[model samples]
Target chain A: VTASLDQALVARDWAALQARYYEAAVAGDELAGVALLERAYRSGIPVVALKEHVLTPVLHLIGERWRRGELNIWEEHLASQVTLAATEHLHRQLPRAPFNGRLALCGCPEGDLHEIALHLVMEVLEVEGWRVLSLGPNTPLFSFADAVRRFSPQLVCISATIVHDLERLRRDYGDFYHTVRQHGARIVIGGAAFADPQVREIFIHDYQAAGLTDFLDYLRREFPTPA
Target chain B: LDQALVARDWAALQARYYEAAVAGDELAGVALLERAYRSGIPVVALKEHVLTPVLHLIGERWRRGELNIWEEHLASQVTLAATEHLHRQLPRAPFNGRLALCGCPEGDLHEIALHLVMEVLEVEGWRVLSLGPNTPLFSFADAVRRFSPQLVCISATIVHDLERLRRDYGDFYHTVRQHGARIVIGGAAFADPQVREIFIHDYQAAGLTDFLDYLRREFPTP
Candidate 1:
């Protein structure tokens, strides 16, 4: 497959290259996507270049196709399954950046909440070489604090997606915040329920809010290179 | 049958649908919904086209890693409102069965998608016992005892509340099944195919139409 990919690239067979990708993607072929991505990267091209030239455009085209009814749900699901697997595989292949300090992502248990973004953040941090642990979604407040203490992470991320759950968040996080702050860990809150301006205003008096860019900034600021 | 309500034609859509709705031509109002569903030659699309599209936008934006939790929740509220509107317009069939619905112990979910589910089932001729939202596990059990519904439905949109779903499912199903009631679950948390498969007492697919089919199949009216 690598040789054929090389041949396709050499022959300037854009259609072949993309078709190969689609075939692999539709087959839920994570290994193939990983190999393709890695091969593209190893060709001395930068990851961003590959993303700009291949990955992003491919996703955009495919996603548009989905919206246009060109790709059925089964096709979309298969593509997504493979793409996600490919993303995970890329995470595994990434070399650790050797950053200091730990980070943990968790949700209020008492169960019944789910936040994929927080989990994605954890995965992203792990890829970036942070000592990261995903405590899974919807952990009890007590368990959350326990995970923080056990991990001794410099940052703790909690995801909440419902406003009604705000009271529970306040109740659990208010106490947990005192405990974590005493031990010196920053707490970050995120989720679909928190995306509104009004909701942000409400939560501002409570936990520290972090958007994607802000959260990324926090990581960069908190884990600066050694002087 | 006019060439109206194209994408980029919000005024046309609003004018037509609002007039139709005012005139009690519910089907005509529904037909004009396409203008909102698609993007057009002139302007970007409005918020959402249908109740389902409203959710699609919310979920899609959330998944894009761009939107925040609060915006997503706001979208949900809007979508639920649309759902309520469509729900009210649908003529209720003759009562052939009854179902009770609510959220579990966490008290942290929208808690109203349950009502929407009840409304849909009611449209199908089920005497819906709509338990609004945020009732405790014991409270739900008590309701089941008093209601003795043929079907018990649970709904939740948040993920943290997922494990609590097991608790809700356990308590609600146990109590109701003891009295020979069927348990059905639905909502975003249970929408994933993996979750749906593992959670096999009885589960509704995401869309109102999908869920309506499940209801029709499970409790066919005599």
Candidate 2:
């Protein structure tokens, strides 16, 4: 298996391998899916690229299939569980440290349970050498605000998927916004909710990430690396 | 590990531990738990045999009106702290790099069972992230994405209303399904077999040891 995977990597057969992996994921075969991820990693594909080329595309395809009724809930879940586990293990196993002395406290806001987006942000932040404390999802305003003060992270990123959270943040979390600035941490907000022009008006963030690609763009601006 | 604790009297240990925790002797409670740990007791034995029975007593007494609400909280806090303190010293097998996301479901604050489950999973060498208690479903699904746990163990000691559990957690059930994370529901909420059957779950654990045993059997160390 490793021998074949090595040849595929050397040959740049990403699509071929990803095609095989897609079938495995869709089949609800966690072992096959994880084997592919580990093989790709061991065979020299970067985690980011694996995520971009393999994980996201297959995952999106599954969602699309489910939306179209091409897949049932159980079958889609089986694939997702397999893919999710494989991706999570590969991502977390990356050797990490707070080498640059920058810490990122990342999570989704209260009532916003769409945390998958924030997961990507944290991963990129860690890969970029920023230490991250992932508070995951539905964190209350008080806890989120207090964590900013308590952890005193250099960068605090909150991702919101639900409009109600963006609404709550605008109406009730004035102290929270003030606290982040007072503690000298840059508060960066992102998520699906912000795509709405209506939601963009409710935002009071020190910085905004229109998307993950731009969040990366923002990362370079905030914490530049070697040229 | 069972043999290591076989010679001791767990009921007697429970009584002493219960007295210390209820009396607000946090140190004494923690100290006794450590003594049991030092004797080479399994983490499951420490929780299942020594600690949990004491808590069962706390609940029964509270129901019988023998223990005040404040005292129950005090006892729970003591055990909660002891569990937290002992967790660091608990033996963990080499990590399999698989994560287990454990927590009480939304509106369920009985987290003692959740902690025990987390500790047992840790002993199995599975990395665990606890959402603690009263976690909203949206956050849990989001957690699945962030953590990528293969197993999501949702524990509850109380369910005030069955329909409410279905209404709220049923929504969560969809999210978990969406992520394809296998879930195990435990604690008193699903204690009734009829209640357990209503939801579609990958597994349902009745006891900590049973859950631990299931993990060991299914996801063995590589």
Top lDDT: which candidate number?
Answer: 2
List each model's interface RMSD: 20.3, 12.2
- Top candidate on DockQ is 2
Ten-residue segment with the worst summed lDDT in candidate 1 chain A? Answer: A202-211
Residue A192, candidate 1: C-alpha displacement in angstroms: 4.9
lDDT by residue for model 1 over A14-38, one digit each (tens)? 5665677677665445567778777
User: B93-141 in candidate 1: lDDT tens per residue?
Assistant: 7877565444433454565456556666666786654434444555556
Model 1 residue B110 CA deviation in Å: 24
CA lDDT, candidate 1, residue B15: 49
* Stretches of model 1 off by over 4 angstroms after superposition: A1-26, A44-73, A99-103, A106-120, A138-142, A158-167, A189-193, A198-216, B1-222
Q: Summarize candidate 2's per-residue lDDT along A71-183 as a digit string, tens digits.
A: 64444544544665566556757776446778787776666655556766777787788866666666666666766765677887888777765556676578877888888
* TM-score of each model, paired residue for residue: 0.39, 0.59
Q: Give the interface-residue alpha carbon RMSD of model 1.
A: 20.3
| TM-score between model 1 and native | 0.39
Q: DockQ, per-model, please?
A: 0.01, 0.08
